[PDB]
């Protein structure tokens, strides 16, 4: 564009000008700097050097891991990390400039496209699953009640991992998966909120000093939350209630004996 400006300045005399001879040099070296065939070649290169097998990695849907950290844990992983960007790369080169793009890579990208959304849903389900497990095991009481749903999620996770590449039955598993983890997540969120209301009452049992009406009110509210727990039944709800009641008895008897002495 700047060259066009100078082409307008003198027409042809700007070329062999007093300083246009140097402008021409700056432009020529800058053209050699601005080259993309090197990048196109490196792209087709790398993709044809190691992404020849990266393309159709759709079979082994699930893959266990190893993560050298404290304890050296292992996670779950689906095999679609750079491939999706390669699909976008091909579409960009084709619509953008258009080359004699390697047709084999284009058709392998096509095969990745026709199975890609499934993998997206699976990957997000896995990530949400991991996030929920983080929240769950960061707590400890919750495990008692979540136990059933957590086993449910892992039941379908086991049924999903066990199979790899089910060309016929894929979509229903994906949808089942999404709803299970979706429910699961809502249950953890729901329970978290419930528990904190419970604990504000529990931790407030030493606040309203010696008023049976208020005590009664607190308890009623707490078990309203307990019927909420009953409906969407969690796992071992009465057991956790036994725990509650024991500590409630202790806060009660403690407030009692304190007031007993004062009275």
């Amino acid at each position: 564009a700047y060259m066009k400006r100078v082409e307008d300045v003198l027409g042809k005399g700007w070329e062999n000008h007093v300083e246009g001879q140097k402008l021409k040099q700056d432009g020529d070296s800058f053209r050699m700097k601005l080259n993309t065939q090197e990048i196109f070649d490196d792209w087709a290169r790398k993709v044809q050097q190691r992404n020849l097998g990266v393309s159709g990695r759709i079979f082994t849907i699930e893959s266990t891991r190893v993560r050298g950290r404290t304890g050296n844990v292992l996670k779950l992983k689906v095999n679609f990390l750079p491939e999706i960007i390669t699909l976008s790369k091909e579409v960009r080169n084709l619509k953008w400039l258009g080359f004699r793009v390697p047709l084999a890579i284009v058709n392998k990208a096509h095969q990745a496209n026709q199975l890609y959304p499934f993998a997206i849903s699976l990957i997000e389900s896995v990530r949400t699953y991991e996030r929920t497990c983080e929240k769950v095991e960061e707590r400890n009481t919750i495990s008692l009640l979540v136990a059933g749903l957590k086993k449910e999620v892992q039941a379908l996770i086991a049924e999903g991992i066990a199979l790899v590449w089910e060309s016929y039955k894929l979509d229903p598993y994906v949808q089942r998966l999404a709803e299970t983890v979706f429910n699961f997540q809502e249950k953890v969120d729901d329970l978290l909120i419930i528990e904190e209301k419970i604990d504000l009452e529990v931790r407030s049992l030493e606040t309203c000093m010696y008023d049976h009406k208020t005590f009664s009110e607190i308890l009623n509210r707490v078990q309203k939350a307990v019927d909420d727990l009953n409906l969407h039944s969690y796992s071992n709800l009465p057991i956790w209630v036994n725990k509650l009641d024991m500590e409630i008895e202790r806060i009660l008897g403690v407030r009692l004996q304190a007031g007993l002495r004062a009275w």
């Binding site: 844990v73 292992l74 095991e137 008692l144 136990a147 957590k150 892992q154 996770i157 991992i161 796992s235």
Partner: peptide
């Protein structure tokens, strides 16, 4: 007196790894 149910995470995962063959 049931001691109904409770499970793990990492355990189930690597156990399925051994089940992957």
């Amino acid at each position: 007196e049931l001691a109904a149910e409770d499970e793990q995470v990492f355990l189930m995962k690597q156990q399925s790894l051994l089940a992957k063959q």
